[PDB]
Amino acid sequence: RPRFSFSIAAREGKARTGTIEMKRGVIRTPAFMPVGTADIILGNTYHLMLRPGAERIAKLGGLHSFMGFDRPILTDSGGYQVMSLTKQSEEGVTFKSHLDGSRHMLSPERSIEIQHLLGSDIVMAFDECTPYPATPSRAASSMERSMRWAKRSRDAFDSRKEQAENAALFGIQQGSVFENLRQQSADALAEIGFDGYAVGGLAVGEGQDEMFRVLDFSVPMLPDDKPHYLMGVGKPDDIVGAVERGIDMFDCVLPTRSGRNGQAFTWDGPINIRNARFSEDLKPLDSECHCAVCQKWSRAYIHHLIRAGEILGAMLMTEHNIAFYQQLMQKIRDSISEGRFSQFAQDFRARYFARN
Template sequence: MTEPAAGTSPASGNAHATDTTFELHTRIGEIDGAAVHGRTGVIHTPHGDIHTPAFIPVATKATVKTLTPEQVRSTGAEAMLSNAYHLYLQPGEDIVDTAGGLAEFENWHGPTYTDSGGFQVMSLGVGFKKVLAMDVANLTEGDIRAAKKERMALVDEDGVDFKSVIDGSAHRFTPEKSMQIQHGLGADIMFAFDELTTLVDTRVYQEESVARTHRWARRCLVEHDRLTRERAHRPLQSLWGVVQGAQYEDLRRQAARGLVELSREAEDAGRRGFGGFGIGGALEKENLGTITSWVCDELPDDRPRHMLGISEPDDLFTCIAAGADTFDCVAPTRLARRGGVYTLDGRLNLMAARHKRDFIPIDTETGGYVNGHYTRAYIHHLLKAHEFLAGTLCTLHNINFMMTLTRNIRRSIEEGRFAEYRDEFLGRYYANIPPEQRGR
């Protein structure tokens, strides 16, 4: 294991002194004469290693829906991400803490992430139907943000008041509360509490939000350090800052530089800094690579970067080239439960009638357990019969597809042929889909 990066040294007296560090391996360097940030590496955590670039399956409520942890592991997945908001509401972080932490509670026994809860507080409270649009061309503000009187979440300087999606009860998240919840959940990697804005927020509001998220990040660092020292009986956890700023270059760069400076200040004061950084917010698809590159220009090479909520194949290639290391998104698993599956020739809907007599695997070339044992016709039957096994098989296949894709991308970087592999894969996957129709 590499020496801990600055600011991630174990807290004094911690009985579980293995911390999360990043080991940089291979850089892409440039594509078509233009410099890029893309690289491969390894994130070392107290519960194991994550080889990057890596897709992190989402286990929202401490489970990847329809799968056992052993099935998730069989795909080659090395980590899972759970949601602090949902686990706070049910069963409660105290239950998970008593069980020994998230990895023990869910029988995963590998690296784990938790997000801060900010996305769910905002999207379920300020937005409608879990929607924070990435493309607002055909939407009005009323499609994206609820009117203030209808919102289930209200933001102020200190935090966010919100109502539970389970029973409507009132709750409040602050940066300190988010840290307390995430320390109780015990994930190896957790994120600072931030404000998630939408693309219809004004420039003035985006400026205010970036400044507020910066102040919240400072409070998260202070509370994270306090809890680390208080909870020396638990493995060390790595706190990552989240870069916001919407589509504005100056705000994105300002937010990234601000978080780096906060981290250095904490380290200089003998406290723990940020072990990595997340890139968040609603982003227009056509600007995704540019925005990621702006942020990575400002972030240190020795810290990993996580792209929040990205899973479309073209977006993966774009973000990896721009410097992102890890990704998470519910899309592969949510799509699977409705019969949507990935193949090297694009996405299929196994509910479609044409698959009723389709006695071939979903995608032979991708391989994996499902392709070795089941046909499209059988899974079509399960979907039509509303059998739970349909969701299991489609989800297992989609996660395997994402693991295979990121593993192949990693290999292509190491072999110096990233651009060639990208063009080959995307040319086939999107052969019949115009760029403007490639959804998120």
């Protein structure tokens, strides 16, 4: 396989389905990328750089060897969690680790180097997720700095032969909700040139209507012939609507967070398995799901395990939720390939929101 090749096999409206070929494997798109701890998984750079540390991961053979996963891994830049969990400047961000108090600076160059030490296959440029709401001035300042940082990320990646020859680099569009800034950002990223283009800054609490409005004008600004990655999104209906707007790749903490907090995704909407109404429900979590949990165990038993505090319960919920997300993406890909995605999206929403 090549280092990176994205091919579009079929289209319906703005939706696309296809493949990304990389040395470590093929990624079917639209793709959902689950947390590593699927054709591709996510590594959490901020977490890994603090425990066990990027140099230690490299000493242990890189992330693929460390976690026993030989297919592609996408790493984020580390910048978002630095703020979530500090001193900012044009150079980067400095911060102290709550784990041991140690000092750490993160810059475009250092982020790319950390991602190199981790050995990931898709590397994210280092940028800022602009807070929401943002004024036009602040959104512009933030986006302009992120574009300067995108060039620095590009140059740092290109300087590391093993990385340049074997990994791929994605740039991130910013600009908050402002069409002109989104356009300026897309133009700057395309001038630098990246293997793929993320839509950043939209997992920030703005609500689905606003997210979709921004996607309506933002995704067409990106190069059509490269993958489009919507970072941090989202619920099943977010994903369907984003695919309708041209997105090819997704990641979100929801399936795992929900799986640890008693929420299971189903074709009839999410359910709170701890609720008493499930104590005698012999149906599987979802009566169409093909996952191993739904082949074997009932809602009543999973309800019991979670209520009893048994770790097995959260594991089964999480396995189901991840598998559900992958089945959603499979149904999306098949429906686009078959020219019936518009009907699928309508049928999906009618059932998911009915909550039957």
